[PDB]
Amino acid sequence: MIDVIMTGELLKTVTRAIVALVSEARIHFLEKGLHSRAVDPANVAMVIVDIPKDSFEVYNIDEEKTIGVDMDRIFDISKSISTKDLVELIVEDESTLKVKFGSVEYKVALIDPSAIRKEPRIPELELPAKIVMDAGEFKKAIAAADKISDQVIFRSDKEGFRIEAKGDVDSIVFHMTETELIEFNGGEARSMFSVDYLKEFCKVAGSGDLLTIHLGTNYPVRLVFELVGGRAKVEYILAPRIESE
Amino acid sequence: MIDVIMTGELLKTVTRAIVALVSEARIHFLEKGLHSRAVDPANVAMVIVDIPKDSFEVYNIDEEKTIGVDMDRIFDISKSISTKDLVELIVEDESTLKVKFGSVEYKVALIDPSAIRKEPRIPELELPAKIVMDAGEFKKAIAAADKISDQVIFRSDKEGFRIEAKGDVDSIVFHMTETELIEFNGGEARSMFSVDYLKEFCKVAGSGDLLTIHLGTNYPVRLVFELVGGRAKVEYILAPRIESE
Amino acid sequence: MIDVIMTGELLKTVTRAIVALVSEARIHFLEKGLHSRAVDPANVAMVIVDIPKDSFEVYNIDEEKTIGVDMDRIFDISKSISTKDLVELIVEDESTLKVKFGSVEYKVALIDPSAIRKEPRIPELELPAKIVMDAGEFKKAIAAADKISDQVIFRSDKEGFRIEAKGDVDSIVFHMTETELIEFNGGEARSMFSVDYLKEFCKVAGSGDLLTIHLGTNYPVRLVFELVGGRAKVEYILAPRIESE
Amino acid sequence: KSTQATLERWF
Amino acid sequence: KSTQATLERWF
Amino acid sequence: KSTQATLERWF
Numbered sequence: 001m002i003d004v005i006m007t008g009e010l011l012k013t014v015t016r017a018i019v020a021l022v023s024e025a026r027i028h029f030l031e032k033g034l035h036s037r038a039v040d041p042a043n044v045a046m047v048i049v050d051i052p053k054d055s056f057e058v059y060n061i062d063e064e065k066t067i068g069v070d071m072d073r074i075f076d077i078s079k080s081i082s083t084k085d086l087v088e089l090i091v092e093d094e095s096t097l098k099v100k101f102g103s104v105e106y107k108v109a110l111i112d113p114s115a116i117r118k119e120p121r122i123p124e125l126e127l128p129a130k131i132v133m134d135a136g137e138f139k140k141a142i143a144a145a146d147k148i149s150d151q152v153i154f155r156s157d158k159e160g161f162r163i164e165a166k167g168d169v170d171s172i173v174f175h176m177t178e179t180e181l182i183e184f185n186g187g188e189a190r191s192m193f194s195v196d197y198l199k200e201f202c203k204v205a206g207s208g209d210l211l212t213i214h215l216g217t218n219y220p221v222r223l224v225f226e227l228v229g230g231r232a233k234v235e236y237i238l239a240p241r242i243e244s245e
Numbered sequence: 246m247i248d249v250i251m252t253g254e255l256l257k258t259v260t261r262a263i264v265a266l267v268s269e270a271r272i273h274f275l276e277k278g279l280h281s282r283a284v285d286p287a288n289v290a291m292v293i294v295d296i297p298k299d300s301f302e303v304y305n306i307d308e309e310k311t312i313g314v315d316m317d318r319i320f321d322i323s324k325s326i327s328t329k330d331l332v333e334l335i336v337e338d339e340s341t342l343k344v345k346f347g348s349v350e351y352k353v354a355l356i357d358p359s360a361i362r363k364e365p366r367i368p369e370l371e372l373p374a375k376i377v378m379d380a381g382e383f384k385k386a387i388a389a390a391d392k393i394s395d396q397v398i399f400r401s402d403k404e405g406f407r408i409e410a411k412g413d414v415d416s417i418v419f420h421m422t423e424t425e426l427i428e429f430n431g432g433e434a435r436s437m438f439s440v441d442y443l444k445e446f447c448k449v450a451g452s453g454d455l456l457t458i459h460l461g462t463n464y465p466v467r468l469v470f471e472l473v474g475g476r477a478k479v480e481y482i483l484a485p486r487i488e489s490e
Numbered sequence: 491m492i493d494v495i496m497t498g499e500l501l502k503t504v505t506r507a508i509v510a511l512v513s514e515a516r517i518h519f520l521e522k523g524l525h526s527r528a529v530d531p532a533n534v535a536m537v538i539v540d541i542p543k544d545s546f547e548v549y550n551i552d553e554e555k556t557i558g559v560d561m562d563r564i565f566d567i568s569k570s571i572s573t574k575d576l577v578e579l580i581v582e583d584e585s586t587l588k589v590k591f592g593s594v595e596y597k598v599a600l601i602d603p604s605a606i607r608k609e610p611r612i613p614e615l616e617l618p619a620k621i622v623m624d625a626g627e628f629k630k631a632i633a634a635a636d637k638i639s640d641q642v643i644f645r646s647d648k649e650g651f652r653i654e655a656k657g658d659v660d661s662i663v664f665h666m667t668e669t670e671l672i673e674f675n676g677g678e679a680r681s682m683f684s685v686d687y688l689k690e691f692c693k694v695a696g697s698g699d700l701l702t703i704h705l706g707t708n709y710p711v712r713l714v715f716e717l718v719g720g721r722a723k724v725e726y727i728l729a730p731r732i733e734s735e
Numbered sequence: 736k737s738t739q740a741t742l743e744r745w746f
Numbered sequence: 747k748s749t750q751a752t753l754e755r756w757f
Numbered sequence: 758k759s760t761q762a763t764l765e766r767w768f
Contacts, residue, residue: 043763073415080389103382103425104389108415123768137593144570144594151759170563170598180593192759220767239767241759288741318660325634348627348670349634353660368746396737437737465745484745486737533752613757641748682748710756729756731748 002029002067002091003060006051008081008101011089013227014049015078017204017234019071021047026113027069029061029091039120045197046120046237055231057086067091068111074099077106123237127216129156132183133176135225136207141174143202146195148172151241154215156189161213165195182210189215191240201236218242247274247312247336248305251296253326253346256334258472259294260323262449262479264316266292271358272314274306274336284365290442291365291482300476302331312336313356319344322351368482372461374401377428378421380470381452386419388447391440393417396486399460401434406458410440427455434460436485446481463487492519492557492581493550496541498571498591501579503717504539505568507694507724509561511537516603517559519551519581529610535687536610536727545721547576557581558601564589567596613727617706619646622673623666625715626697631664633692636685638662641731644705646679651703655685672700679705681730691726708732 014036018025021040028035033052039045053059074097081087081101090098091110099106145152145165155162160177161184178184205211205225214222223236259281263270266285273280278297284290298304319342326332326346335343336355344351390397390410400407405422406429423429450456450470459467468481504526508515511530518525523542529535543549564587571577571591580588581600589596635642635655645652650667651674668674695701695715704712713726 039764043765044761046764070414076392077389077415077417080385080392102385103421104386104417104419106389106415106417120764121768123764125767140570140592141594144567144596147566147570169560170567170596172567172594172596174594176593194761220764237764239762239764241761244758244760284742288743289739291742315659321637322634322660322662325630325637347630348666349631349662349664351634351660351662365742366746368742370745439739465742482742484740484742486739489736489738529753533754534750536753610753611757613753615756684750710753727753729751729753731750734747734749 001060001062002065002089003058004029004034004056005058005086005088006056007228008083008085008087010051010055010228010232011081011087012078012083013204013232014051014234015071015075017047017049017227017236019075020200020204021045023072024068024070024111024116026066026116026119028064028066030064031061033059037119037122038117044239046123048122048235048237050233051231055228065091066113067097068113068116069097070108070111073108077108080104123220125214125216125219125222127189127214127219127222128187129161129189129213129215130183130185130187131156131161131181131213131215133161133181133211133213134207135202135205135209135211137176138211139202139205139207142195142198144172144174146199149195151192151194152198153190153192154213154221156187156215158186160184183212188217190217191215191219191221192243193221193238193240197238201238204234246305246307247310247334248303249274249279249301250303250331250333251301252473253328253330253332255296255300255473255477256326256332257323257328258449258477259296259479260316260320262292262294262472262481264320265445265449266290268317269313269315269356269361271311271361271364273309273311275309276306278304282364282367283362289484291368293367293480293482295478296476300473310336311358312342313358313361314342315353315356318353322353325349368465370459370461370464370467372434372459372464372467373432374406374434374458374460375428375430375432376401376406376426376458376460378406378426378456378458379452380447380450380454380456382421383456384447384450384452387440387443389417389419391444394440396437396439397443398435398437399458399466401432401460403431405429428457433462435462436460436464436466437488438466438483438485442483446483449479491550491552492555492579493548494519494524494546495548495576495578496546497718498573498575498577500541500545500718500722501571501577502568502573503694503722504541504724505561505565507537507539507717507726509565510690510694511535513562514558514560514601514606516556516606516609518554518556520554521551523549527609527612528607534729536613538612538725538727540723541721545718555581556603557587558603558606559587560598560601563598567598570594613710615704615706615709615712617679617704617709617712618677619651619679619703619705620673620675620677621646621651621671621703621705623651623671623701623703624697625692625695625699625701627666628701629692629695629697632685632688634662634664636689639685641682641684642688643680643682644703644711646677646705648676650674673702678707680707681705681709681711682733683711683728683730687728691728694724
């Protein structure tokens with residue numbers, strides 16, 4: 001009889017990150033906490049969200065059950081739930097999901113977890129560069145590149161982490177030596193991506209949070225955010241745009 | 246020679262509530278204060294606004310006169326008048342209305358009070374349930390129902406006041422036992438309405454104000470708000486949506 | 491090797507005032523500071539911006555050079571640069587302009603200063619009335635007139651400064667006796683203008699700044715704003731709408 | 736089903 | 747009536 | 758030129 005209670009900002013962060021690529025994903029209530037991973041219909045990006053049980057103001061499961069949650073209606077209802085308005089999720093039945101907050105109890109029906117596209121096996125990626133920086137400084141690097149182009153270049157070496165965008169009349173570069181990055185392993189990496197997705201990922205995160213970036217050469221990029229003050233871990237994996245010769 | 250002075254938030258609250266159903270209503274400058282009631286062209290809802298003379302920072306009439314005020318131009322001009330910018334309304338003539346605030350003096354011509362549709366006799370409604378709650382908690386009950394449906398159900402009994410909305414995949418219910426309501430007479434009542442109007446009424450009011458609701462069964466609903474910190478009383482009467490068998 | 495450093499609010503104020511009438515203007519790096527003047531393609535209004543060298547947190551020129559700056563891309567990039575994010579402009583070359591702020595270095599190519607329309611000789615206007623008031627009180631006088639009409643009348647005499655707008659059902663007047671104006675020479679003047687431009691000029695300025703107005707009769711109007719707390723002087727000159735008999 | 740009524744019936 | 751003038755007349 | 762790839766190649 002799932003009976004969880006999280007803060008409003010917590011539910012609003014995950015539902016947004018998820019529904020940011022899907023409209024219905026399977027949510028996994030495990031012993032270690034809440035899990036849920038999905039790829040967009042396009043098959044370009046992947047999101048993996050984790051909420052260990054210590055982020056909830058209570059997390060009561062009576063067996064690890066998976067539920068098919070209609071992410072759109074959930075996200076849509078979430079725009080009511082307040083930031084401080086504790087929300088309690090309950091699934092004491094098999095057909096519906098009760099969402100309680102304030103004097104409102106919303107009840108949306110559940111989906112057959114196996115009725116939704118089966119999620120993607122979490123990749124086993126081995127990437128050269130590992131950059132740890134602030135999500136805000138990052139979100140500002142993406143916002144800037146969006147005015148110059150549809151794509152950007154993540155360039156890593158020993159002299160720091162670089163993100164570059166070029167237009168036919170201008171260019172922009174976001175550089176942070178290892179000395180200004182929270183962490184940096186200095187590995188050499190270089191992959192190009194579409195600002196479109198990168199800008200969409202940046203929505204579920206703001207300044208003040210941290211971000212680890214796993215970059216390789218002509219490989220996808222892993223964007224692991226510590227959201228809601230380290231209470232929610234949202235990872236976005238974007239496929240690269242390969243330089244066609 | 247009408248010569249009144251109210252706060253900006255005061256004029257902005259009434260003109261909005263009025264023009265929310267009409268574009269030109271007769272305003273009545275009485276001895277007890279300012280009055281004005283109108284129904285929308287549709288004939289579905291009615292608004293009754295009252296401002297006793299003690300809400301004005303001066304209220305000078307030289308006989309109880311009724312003026313036909315073009316609510317649209319007034320509302321439109323009101324978007325200038327500041328919240329703290331005291332505004333003085335003057336009608337020392339018969340053709341125009343001077344609105345003063347700051348270094349601006351706006352002069353809109355008046356309408357023949359008897360040239361506008363004659364207002365509706367304030368109904369003599371006798372309703373079973375009487376609920377007193379906060380306008381904010383209420384505005385949040387309506388905002389939520391708007392995502393689920395075009396209509397809602399106000400259900401009253403002894404176990405509290407209920408507002409419910411249902412969709413083909415979800416439902417929501419706003420419940421407050423008499424123990425959590427400011428006041429509640431516990432009478433049994435149940436009427437359905439259109440979220441459309443209810444959401445429009447909620448505009449002229451925000452959290453922190455109070456609201457008395459008079460509900461019956463298959464009867465209209467009376468929504469009496471104490472706006473501008475008990476200085477303005479705005480009542481909205483909406484006709485019910487009758488369950489057609 | 492131009493090497494200047496200004497505050498973010500400083501660059502954002504000028505680029506906006508400029509690009510408010512042009513999309514590419516010549517910027518003049520003089521000994522006394524930064525200069526740049528342009529008229530819109532229409533030839534109705536003119537903007538003259540001045541930034542003496544004491545507004546910069548450093549201003550290093552190695553000869554007074556004029557650069558053709560693509561105002562659109564600059565303004566567009568400026569929406570990133572933060573209000574407190576010091577920005578350093580560099581032109582150590584002849585083809586591009588480096589804009590640095592935070593961890594971003596934007597590089598937009600320059601234009602042949604003589605490739606852009608040659609700027610208008612600053613007029614030698616002799617105007618009767620000289621009004622000094624707050625830009626905010628002024629911006630509020632324009633915002634109000636915009637609801638009544640497309641044009642306004644600046645009327646000056648001894649009894650104060652007046653700005654009036656009339657519709658076919660209402661009128662508005664903004665009056666400030668010399669006693670309420672910062673300064674006023676009381677000269678007699680009266681010219682009509684289009685609220686359109688006047689509202690566009692008011693964008694680059696807000697309440698708290700000062701404004702000197704040079705008005706004559708059937709002559710253009712000079713609007714000199716002390717922006718960014720007296721650190722930037724932006725002047726707008728609008729041609730009058732002549733009363734055709 | 737449901738039919739929005741009018742206030743004329745109650746006045 | 748009113749006719750928007752141009753700045754060319756004054757420069 | 759550049760071609761957006763898919764995640765299928767890496768899974």
